[PDB]
Structures are given as C-alpha cells and as structure tokens.
C-alpha cells in the first residue's frame, strides 16, 4: 500500500533512568539568620507555582526500594555535611591527660567537672581550664581519676561552627531538561508494583532532611490508615517502614541552663565549652501523649494483621542488641544530640480484637560522626541558653524476630540501622524517568518527489 | 492537554498536540538564572550538580536535533520520509496502530530495530533527495 | 663482632597531645644522614 514513515519530535515516551537532579527552595534563612547547613548560602529558588498533571490511562510501575532517588538523597547529605565542617576549628589539642570529678553527690552524678591543660594563643605559653563534659564522651585509663576523649582514640575531631544550624528546612529535587519525576498518586500503595494514578510533577513535594533514628519526625503520611511497606515481607530479616494518617506530637526538652566558656587555642579559633550550670541538674526528657499514642500503636497491628499470620499474637520488645547510639531514638535540635530510650513505647502488646503523658528519659552527646562514618568526628558545641523542640512523629521502623521457624507468634523490635531508610519514608511515590522525544510511525504520506 | 497530557491517551492524540512536550524540553522555570542575586565560595555540591545538569540538558537536546537537521526535518516538528515501511517491521493496519496502541506501547514496538530505521532515513530523504539537484539543479 | 639498615629509636607524639611515646623503626639507607660514640 506504499506506507511510508513519517517522523515525529515530542512523543510522550519515557524510559526508567536516574540524572542528577539539584535543590530548589524559596526564602527561608535569609537575613536574621542564614548559614543553614543544608541549603547552604543560596539554592536556586523553587517557583511559587508547582506543577501537577494527572496522566491519564497511565499504569507506570514504581519502586521504592530499588530507587535511586534516595541513594542520590544519602550520598547528597553526606557531602553536603563534610563541606559544612571542612573551614572550622579543628580540635586536635584538646586530646590531653584528663583529670575529672564528680558534681554534688553532697555526701545524681552523670556529668564530671574536667580540668586539662591546653595551648593558649601562644605557643610558647600554656593555660589551665575547667570545662564539663557529658558520660560516656570520655572514658578512663588505667585516687584520683584520670580521662580521655573517647574519639582522639579513634578519629580526628573537628567543632562544629559556632552559628550554624541544623535544623532541617524543605529540599526540594527536581528533573533536569528532558527529564520528569513521576508521582504515586494511588493512596493504597502496598510495597510497590503498578501505580494507577500518575502524575509527572517538575518538582517533589516539601523534604525536609530530619535526621531521625529509629522514629521519623516531619514526614509526610497519606490519607487512608497506616501504610507499611518493606522490600519483603516475611524476609525477617528486611527492616519495615511505617506510615502514620495522624501524627503524634512528642515534645522535648533540655531543662540545663548552660553557659558559654569560650577559651582560644591558639589565634582565631575557639572552643566554646560548657560553662557552670546554673539551677538544680534535671534529665532531658520526651512527652508523649499516652492517649494518642495507644491509638496509633493500634492501627499498625491491624493493618499488620492481613500481612503476618493473620489473626495471631504480636508483641512489641524493646530495641533489642545493638550499640547504645543505634538503639535509641537519636535526633538534631537546636544543636544538642538527644538520645532517648524508647523502651517505654515498645512494651505494650494487644491481641485477639489534665491528662496522662508517657516521658521518655533521654541523654546528651556531643561527640559525634554519623551515618556510621569512621572518617572524622565533630563536637557540637553546647547551645547556650534553653532548648526546646516540637516536632510531629510520623514514621517508623522495625525489625526481626529472630529465626522462628514458623511457630506460635511474631515480634516487631525498633531498629532505625540505616539513615537512607528514613528518606525512603519520604521517596517512596517519586521516581525519574527519561523522555525520548524522537518517534517513527507509518502513514501513507511522502514528501514532494524531487528536491 | 499539559506535559505529557496525551501520554495514556492513543497515538492520534499525541499526534494532535505534540508541542507541549517538545516546548518543554531545553529550558525551564527550575534552572531559574542561577545565582542567589537580591561566604564567597560557589564550589558547593550544589553548583556541581546544576551545572552538570544543564549541560547534559542541551547534550542530550543537541543529540537528538541533530537527527532531525541530518533527515531534512530541522525546520518542522512533522515531517514525511520517502523511505517505504517495511512489513517485516509490523504486521498491523493502518488504522489498527494509531487507534489502539498509544506511543507508550509503540516504542516497545520498534526498540529492537529503531536503530535500523534511523540508518535508512539519512539515506533516502537526505543522501539521495539533496544529491537529486545535480540533475535538476541546472541542466 | 652486612649492614645496610638501621635499628631506629626516636621520641615521638602519641594519641594524646600531652604525653610522648618511644618506639623502635627501620629505615633504609640513604633515607637518614647523620648530624655532626652514639650515632644520631
Ligand atoms: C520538625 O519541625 C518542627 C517545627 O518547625 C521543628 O521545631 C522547630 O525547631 C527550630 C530549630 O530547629 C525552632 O527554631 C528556633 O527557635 C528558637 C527559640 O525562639 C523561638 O520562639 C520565638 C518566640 O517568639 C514569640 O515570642 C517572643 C517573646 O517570647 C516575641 O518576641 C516574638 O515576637 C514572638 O511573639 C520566636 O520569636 C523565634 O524565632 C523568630 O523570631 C525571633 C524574634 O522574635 C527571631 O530572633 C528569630 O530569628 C525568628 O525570626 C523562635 O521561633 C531560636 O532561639 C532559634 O535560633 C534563633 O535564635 C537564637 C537565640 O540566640 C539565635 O542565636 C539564632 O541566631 C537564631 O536567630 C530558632 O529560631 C522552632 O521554634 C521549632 N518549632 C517551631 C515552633 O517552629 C523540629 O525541630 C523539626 N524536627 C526536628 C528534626 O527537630
Ligand atoms: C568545676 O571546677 C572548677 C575548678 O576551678 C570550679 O571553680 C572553682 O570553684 C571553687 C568553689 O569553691 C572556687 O573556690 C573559690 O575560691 C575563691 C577565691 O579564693 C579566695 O578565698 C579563699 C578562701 O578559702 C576558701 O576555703 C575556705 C576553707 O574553709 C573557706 O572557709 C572559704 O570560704 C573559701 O571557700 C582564700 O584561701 C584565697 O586566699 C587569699 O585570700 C584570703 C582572703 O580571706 C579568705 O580566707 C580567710 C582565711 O584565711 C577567711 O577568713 C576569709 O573569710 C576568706 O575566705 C586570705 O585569707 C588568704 O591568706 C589569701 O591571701 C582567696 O582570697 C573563694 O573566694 C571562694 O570562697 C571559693 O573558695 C575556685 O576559685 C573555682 N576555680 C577557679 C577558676 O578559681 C567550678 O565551680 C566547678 N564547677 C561548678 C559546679 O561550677
Ligand atoms: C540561665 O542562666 C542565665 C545567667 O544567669 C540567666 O540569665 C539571666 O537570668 C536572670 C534571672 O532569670 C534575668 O533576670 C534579671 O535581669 C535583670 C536585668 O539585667 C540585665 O539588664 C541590666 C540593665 O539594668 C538592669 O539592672 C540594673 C542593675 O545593674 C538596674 O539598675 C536596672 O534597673 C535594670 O534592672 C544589665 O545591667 C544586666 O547586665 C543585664 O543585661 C538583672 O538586673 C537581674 O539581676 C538580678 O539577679 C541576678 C541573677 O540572675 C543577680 O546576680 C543580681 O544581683 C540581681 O539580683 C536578673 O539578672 C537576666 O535578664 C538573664 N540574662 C542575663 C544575660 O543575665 C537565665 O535567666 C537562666 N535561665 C533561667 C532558668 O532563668
Ligand atoms: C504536625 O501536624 C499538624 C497537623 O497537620 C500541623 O499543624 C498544621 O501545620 C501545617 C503546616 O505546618 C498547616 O498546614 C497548612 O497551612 C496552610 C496555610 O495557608 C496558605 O499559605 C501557606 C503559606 O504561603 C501555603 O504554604 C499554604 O499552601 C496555603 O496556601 C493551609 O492553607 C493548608 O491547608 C490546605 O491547603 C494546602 C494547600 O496545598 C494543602 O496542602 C493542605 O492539605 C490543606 O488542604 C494547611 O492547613 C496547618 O494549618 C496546621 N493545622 C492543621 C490542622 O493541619 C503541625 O504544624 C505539624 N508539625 C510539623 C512540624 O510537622
Ligand atoms: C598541667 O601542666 C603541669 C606542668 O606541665 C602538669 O604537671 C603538674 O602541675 C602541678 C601544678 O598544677 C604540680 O603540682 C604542684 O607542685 C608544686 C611544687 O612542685 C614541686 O614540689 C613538689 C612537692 O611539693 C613540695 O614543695 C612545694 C613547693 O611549693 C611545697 O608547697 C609543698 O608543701 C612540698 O614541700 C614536687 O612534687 C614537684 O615535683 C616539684 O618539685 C606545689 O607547690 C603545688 O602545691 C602543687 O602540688 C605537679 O607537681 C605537676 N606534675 C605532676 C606530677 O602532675 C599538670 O599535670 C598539667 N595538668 C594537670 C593534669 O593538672
Ligand atoms: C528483539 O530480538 C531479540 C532477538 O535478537 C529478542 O531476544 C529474545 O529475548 C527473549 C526475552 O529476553 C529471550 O528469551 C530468553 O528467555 C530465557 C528463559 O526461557 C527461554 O527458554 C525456554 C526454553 O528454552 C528452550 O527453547 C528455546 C526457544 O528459543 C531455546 O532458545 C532454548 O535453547 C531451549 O531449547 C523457553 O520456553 C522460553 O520461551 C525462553 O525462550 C532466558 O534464559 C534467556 O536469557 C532469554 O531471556 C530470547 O532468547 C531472545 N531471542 C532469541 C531468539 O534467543 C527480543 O525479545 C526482541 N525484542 C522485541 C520486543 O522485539
Ligand atoms: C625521648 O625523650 C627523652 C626525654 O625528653 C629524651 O631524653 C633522655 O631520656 C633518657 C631516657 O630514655 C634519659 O636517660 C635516663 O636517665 C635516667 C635518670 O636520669 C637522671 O639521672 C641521670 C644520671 O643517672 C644517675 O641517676 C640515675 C637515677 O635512676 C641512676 O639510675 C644512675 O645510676 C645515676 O646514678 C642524669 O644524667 C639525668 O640528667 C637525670 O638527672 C636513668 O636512670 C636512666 O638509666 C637513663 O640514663 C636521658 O637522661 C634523657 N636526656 C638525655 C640527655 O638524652 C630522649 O633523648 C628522647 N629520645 C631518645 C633519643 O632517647
Ligand atoms: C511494661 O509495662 C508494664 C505495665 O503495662 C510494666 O509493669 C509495671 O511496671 C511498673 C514499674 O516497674 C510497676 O509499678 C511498680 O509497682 C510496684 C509494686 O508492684 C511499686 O512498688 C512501684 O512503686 C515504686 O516505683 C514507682 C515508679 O516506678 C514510684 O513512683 C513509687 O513511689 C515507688 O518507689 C511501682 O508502682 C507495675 O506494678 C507493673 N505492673 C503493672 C500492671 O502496672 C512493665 O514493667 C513494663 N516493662 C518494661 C520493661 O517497660
Ligand atoms: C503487594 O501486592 C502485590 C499484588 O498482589 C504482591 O505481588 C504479588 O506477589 C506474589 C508473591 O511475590 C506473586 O506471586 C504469588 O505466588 C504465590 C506462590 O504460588 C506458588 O505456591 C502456591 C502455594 O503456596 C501455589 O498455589 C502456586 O501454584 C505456586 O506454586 C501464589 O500463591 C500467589 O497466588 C501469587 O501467584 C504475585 O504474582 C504478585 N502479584 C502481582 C502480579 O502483582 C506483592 O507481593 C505485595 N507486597 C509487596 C511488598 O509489594
Ligand atoms: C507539647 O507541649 C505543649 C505545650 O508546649 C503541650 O501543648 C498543649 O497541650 C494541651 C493538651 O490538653 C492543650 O490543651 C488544650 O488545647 C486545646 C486546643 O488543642 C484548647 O482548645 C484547650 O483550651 C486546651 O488549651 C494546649 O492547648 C497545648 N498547647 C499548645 C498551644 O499546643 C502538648 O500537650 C505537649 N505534648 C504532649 C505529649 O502532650
Ligand atoms: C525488510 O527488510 C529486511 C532486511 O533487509 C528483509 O529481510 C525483509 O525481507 C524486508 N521486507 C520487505 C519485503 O519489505
């Protein structure tokens, strides 16, 4: 029949890829106070306007586990933190002889008063100072006690700068030309597979960086009951996320009244340590509101009924082996690093179908290198003044219960191992995709016959 | 309409519109202009990656229009071949195809052999139609 | 009483700023000099 081809620039074909992709976010810290850790001194400012189109008869497939969206995420972070430490105070005389005691027992003690010896802004001359520091930090040697950083035994270490913060603000990641992010639009969303409901946005939704352990903070929820998602169930083995539809509110705070002790090491550079505390010694601790939480505790066995055994036993256990600083719900805020112990959430089971507050007791680090990095430590210097954070709950993550081959019941553990895990509670409806605009079809059409 | 408005829908309806999805293609609202505008270090991360992002923005736009100017078809968005479709390509109808298989389909379709279609289309309608001047040219 | 190498001892900085340590090294030759009974 003499078909002939005919060429055609802009077909809506797409092909699964991964590009770089890069941040977007309007006015944030600005004037008042800049210097933000992630979003750095300028990102390019996202429109005021976002782009949202409910592609029709579309049925692309998603996963969230094999998206490389969230490893771009991790390896994002990671290098945006070391670039926020690299021009700072490095710390490498503070690794002396430490000769520490204990506070008031009056005869309660879990800091220790420590005088050292350190250089001063010559460096001929020497100068002796008091400064407290937090358990566990420091650890002894071998009448009176004798200390040592737990880091100038491994790592380096380096002070975080003095006015910058770490709170997390909304990131946003958007495609590159010829490039589109596609949207998981279908509410009900088990693990992944073909998604009904697409859209091609230009840009995500608001991410906010939380560094979060264990427990998620400021995440994102949709609307029908508790979403649980995992690469594979019934994999034991494979750690679980947990959607929330309602946050809980915990709130926390630091009663400590620290003060500012600024002592040079040299020129320029100075270490900001903990001063003298003023008012009596309280524990830092986490409110949780015991109605709201049993409620939401619920759901979850409800919804994980139809994915384990059914109608049987599930019990919850506190977070089970592991190192201290993994097994606790670890957080940012304000810049002091709370550590609480979330074994009195995770002890409650129920089974077969003005007002009370839990709290939570938690303590302080200020030595840190996160996401398991052996490379360099940093110490947070503490915040001056009072700390208090507010901060919606609204992810979670779970673990094994060891092998039981089959068997009479199943346990769900915390255990936040991994900080990539805690975007994906975030990414898990996004994925980019590569636009082909060059298509070839037949029709029964030629050009003019000599030219 | 909108972005890949036509993407679900059949092949005639993208062929009906089309330009949205080539319009929105080299440029957008999200490269912005760049600077902060309104520390002294732009090395950050962040530069690395927007800079690396616009330029495979018009590499990868350049590639694919190079095609189009090397086939005679620079100047339009549709433009017909005098290259004969060949039915070891697809057994389908002319109206069986652009009814019922929507692009999206399609480019499975030809993917084994796309590459082969693209190495006759330089031929027929640019090696020989811009050679036939040299009868017609000037006798 | 064949010899190329040296038995090293030096005083040199540990993990702690404050205190020293003395440890034992071998270098080749060529890569030390002497300065000016025990050699230095
Ligand atoms: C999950 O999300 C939640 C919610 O976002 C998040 O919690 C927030 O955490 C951030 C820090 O990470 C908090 O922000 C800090 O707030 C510090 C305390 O001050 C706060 O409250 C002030 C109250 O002001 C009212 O009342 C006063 C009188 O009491 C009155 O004068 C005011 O007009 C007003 O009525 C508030 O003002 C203040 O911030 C604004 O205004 C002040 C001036 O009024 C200005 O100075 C600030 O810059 C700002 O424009 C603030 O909200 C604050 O100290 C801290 O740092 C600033 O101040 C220090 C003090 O020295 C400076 O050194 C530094 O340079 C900064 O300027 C910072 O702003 C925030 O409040 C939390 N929640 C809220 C309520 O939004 C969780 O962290 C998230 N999850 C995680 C992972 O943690
Ligand atoms: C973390 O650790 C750090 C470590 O530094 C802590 O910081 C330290 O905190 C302590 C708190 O005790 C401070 O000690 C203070 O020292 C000042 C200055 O010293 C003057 O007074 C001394 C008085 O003697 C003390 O001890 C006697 C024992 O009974 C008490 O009765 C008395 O009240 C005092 O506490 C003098 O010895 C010193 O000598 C010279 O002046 C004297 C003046 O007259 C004093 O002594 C006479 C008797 O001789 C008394 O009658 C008279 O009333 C007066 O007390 C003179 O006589 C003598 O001959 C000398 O000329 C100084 O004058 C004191 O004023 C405070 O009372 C207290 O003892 C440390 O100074 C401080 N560290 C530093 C940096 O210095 C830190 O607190 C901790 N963390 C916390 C929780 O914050
Ligand atoms: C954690 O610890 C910190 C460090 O102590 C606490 O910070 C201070 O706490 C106190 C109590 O809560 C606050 O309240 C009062 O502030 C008053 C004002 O002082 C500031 O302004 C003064 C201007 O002039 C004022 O004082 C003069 C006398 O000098 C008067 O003639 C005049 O009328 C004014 O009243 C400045 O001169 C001064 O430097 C301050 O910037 C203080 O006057 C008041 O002092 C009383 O209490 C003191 C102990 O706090 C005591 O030593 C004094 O003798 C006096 O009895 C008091 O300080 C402060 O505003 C607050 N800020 C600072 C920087 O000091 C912090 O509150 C605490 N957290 C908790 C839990 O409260
Ligand atoms: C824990 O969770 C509680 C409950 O959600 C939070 O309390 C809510 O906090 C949120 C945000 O912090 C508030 O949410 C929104 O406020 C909007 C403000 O109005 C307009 O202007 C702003 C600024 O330009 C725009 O960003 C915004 O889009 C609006 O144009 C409301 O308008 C929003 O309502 C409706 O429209 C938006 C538009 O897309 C939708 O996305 C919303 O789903 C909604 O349909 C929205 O309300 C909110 O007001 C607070 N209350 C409640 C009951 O939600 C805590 O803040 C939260 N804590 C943290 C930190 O997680
Ligand atoms: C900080 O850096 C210093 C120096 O590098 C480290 O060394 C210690 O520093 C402390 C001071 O903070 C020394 O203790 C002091 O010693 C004074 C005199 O020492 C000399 O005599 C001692 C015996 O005392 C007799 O004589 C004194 C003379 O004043 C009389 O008052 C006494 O009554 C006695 O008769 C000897 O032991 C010493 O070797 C000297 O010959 C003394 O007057 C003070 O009261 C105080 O005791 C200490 O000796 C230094 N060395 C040691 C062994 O630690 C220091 O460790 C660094 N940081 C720390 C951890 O503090
Ligand atoms: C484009 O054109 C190419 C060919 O150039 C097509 O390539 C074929 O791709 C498919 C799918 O990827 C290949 O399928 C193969 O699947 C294997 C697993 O099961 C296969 O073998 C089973 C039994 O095998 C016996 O019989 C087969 C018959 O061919 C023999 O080849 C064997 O030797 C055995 O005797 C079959 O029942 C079953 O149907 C499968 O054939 C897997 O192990 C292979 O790696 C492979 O994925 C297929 O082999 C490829 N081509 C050929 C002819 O070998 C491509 O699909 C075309 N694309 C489009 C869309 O047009
Ligand atoms: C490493 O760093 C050190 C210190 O900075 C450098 O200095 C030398 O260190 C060595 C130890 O490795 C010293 O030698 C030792 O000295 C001991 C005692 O010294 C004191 O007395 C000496 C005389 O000895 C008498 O008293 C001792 C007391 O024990 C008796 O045992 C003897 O029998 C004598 O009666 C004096 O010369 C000295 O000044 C002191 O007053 C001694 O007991 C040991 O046997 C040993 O000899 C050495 O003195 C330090 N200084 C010198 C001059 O080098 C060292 O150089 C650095 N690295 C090196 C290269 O080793
Ligand atoms: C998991 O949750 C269960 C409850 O669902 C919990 O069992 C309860 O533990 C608490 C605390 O250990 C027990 O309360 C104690 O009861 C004894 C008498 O049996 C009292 O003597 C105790 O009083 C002292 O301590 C109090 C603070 O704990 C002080 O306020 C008080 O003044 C006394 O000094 C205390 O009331 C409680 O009896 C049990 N049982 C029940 C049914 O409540 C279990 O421990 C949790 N497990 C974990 C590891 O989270
Ligand atoms: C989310 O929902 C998805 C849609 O249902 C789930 O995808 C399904 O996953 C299962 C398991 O991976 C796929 O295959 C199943 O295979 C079992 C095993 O069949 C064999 O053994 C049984 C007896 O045990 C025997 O009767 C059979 O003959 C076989 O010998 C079957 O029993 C199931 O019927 C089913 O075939 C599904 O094909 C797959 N559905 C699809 C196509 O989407 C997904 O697992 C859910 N979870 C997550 C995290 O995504
Ligand atoms: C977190 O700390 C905050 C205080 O900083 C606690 O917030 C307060 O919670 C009480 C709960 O009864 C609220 O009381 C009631 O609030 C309603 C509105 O929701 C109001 O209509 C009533 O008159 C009464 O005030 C109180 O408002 C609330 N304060 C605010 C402004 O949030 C909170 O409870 C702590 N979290 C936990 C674990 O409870
Ligand atoms: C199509 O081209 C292929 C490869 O040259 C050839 O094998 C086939 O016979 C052709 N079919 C026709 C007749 O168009």
């Given amino acids: 029949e003499n078909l002939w081809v005919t060429v055609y620039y802009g077909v809506p074909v797409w092909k699964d890829a991964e590009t770089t992709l890069f941040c977007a976010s309007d006015a944030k810290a600005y004037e008042t106070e800049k210097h933000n850790v992630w979003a750095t001194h300028a990102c390019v400012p996202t429109d005021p306007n976002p782009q949202e189109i409910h592609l029709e008869n579309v049925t692309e497939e998603f996963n969230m586990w094999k998206n490389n969206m969230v490893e771009q995420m991790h390896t994002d972070i990671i290098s945006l933190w070391d670039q926020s430490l690299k021009p700072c105070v490095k710390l490498t005389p503070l690794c002396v002889t430490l000769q520490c005691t204990n506070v008031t027992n009056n005869i309660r003690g879990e800091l220790k008063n420590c005088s050292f010896n350190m250089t001063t802004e010559l460096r001929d001359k020497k100068q002796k100072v008091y400064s407290l520091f937090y358990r566990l930090d420091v650890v002894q040697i071998n009448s009176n006690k004798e200390y040592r950083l737990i880091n100038c035994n491994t790592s380096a270490i380096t002070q975080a700068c003095p006015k910058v913060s770490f709170e997390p603000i909304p990131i946003h990641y958007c495609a590159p030309a010829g490039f589109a992010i596609l949207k998981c639009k279908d509410k009900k969303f088990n693990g992944t597979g073909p998604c009904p409901s697409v859209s091609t946005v230009q840009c995500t939704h608001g991410i906010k960086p939380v560094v979060s352990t264990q427990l998620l903070l400021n995440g994102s929820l949709a609307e029908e009951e508790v979403m649980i998602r995992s690469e594979n169930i019934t994999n034991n083995a494979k750690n679980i996320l947990v959607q929330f539809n309602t946050p809980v509110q915990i709130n926390c705070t630091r009663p400590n009244n620290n003060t500012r002790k600024s002592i040079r090491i040299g020129p320029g550079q100075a270490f900001y340590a903990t001063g003298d505390i003023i008012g009596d010694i309280r524990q830092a601790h986490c409110n949780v509101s015991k109605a709201t939480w049993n409620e939401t505790l619920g759901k979850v066995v409800k919804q994980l009924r139809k994915h384990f055994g059914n109608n049987t036993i599930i019990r919850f256990a506190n977070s089970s082996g592991g190192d201290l600083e993994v097994t606790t719900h670890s957080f940012n805020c304000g810049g002091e690093f709370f550590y609480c112990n979330t074994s009195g959430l995770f002890n409650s089971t129920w089974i077969s179908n003005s007002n009370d507050s839990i709290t939570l007791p938690c303590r302080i680090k200020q030595i840190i290198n996160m996401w398991q990095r052996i490379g360099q430590a940093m110490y947070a210097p503490p915040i001056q003044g009072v700390i208090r954070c507010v901060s919606n709950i609204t992810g979670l993550i779970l673990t094994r219960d060891g092998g039981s081959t089959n068997s009479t019941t199943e346990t769900f553990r915390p255990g936040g191992g991994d900080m990539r895990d805690n975007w994906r509670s975030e990414l898990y409806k996004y994925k980019v995709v590569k636009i082909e605009p060059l298509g070839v079809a037949p029709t029964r059409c030629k050009r003019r016959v000599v030219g | ?139």
């Fill in chain 2, 1 to 139: 309409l909108g972005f890949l408005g036509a993407a679900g829908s059949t092949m005639g309806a993208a062929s009906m519109t089309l330009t949205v999805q080539a319009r929105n293609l080299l440029s957008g609202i999200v490269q912005q202009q760049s600077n902060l505008l309104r520390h002294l270090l732009k090395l950050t991360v962040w530069g690395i990656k927007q800079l690396q992002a616009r330029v495979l923005a018009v590499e990868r736009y350049l590639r694919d229009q190079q095609l189009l100017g090397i086939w005679g078809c620079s100047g339009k968005l549709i433009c017909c071949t005098n290259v004969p479709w060949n039915s070891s390509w697809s057994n389908r109808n002319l109206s069986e195809i652009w009814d019922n298989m929507t692009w999206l389909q399609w480019d499975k379709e030809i993917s084994n052999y796309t590459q082969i279609i693209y190495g006759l289309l330089e031929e027929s309608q640019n090696q020989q139609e811009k050679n036939e001047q040299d009868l017609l040219a000037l006798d």
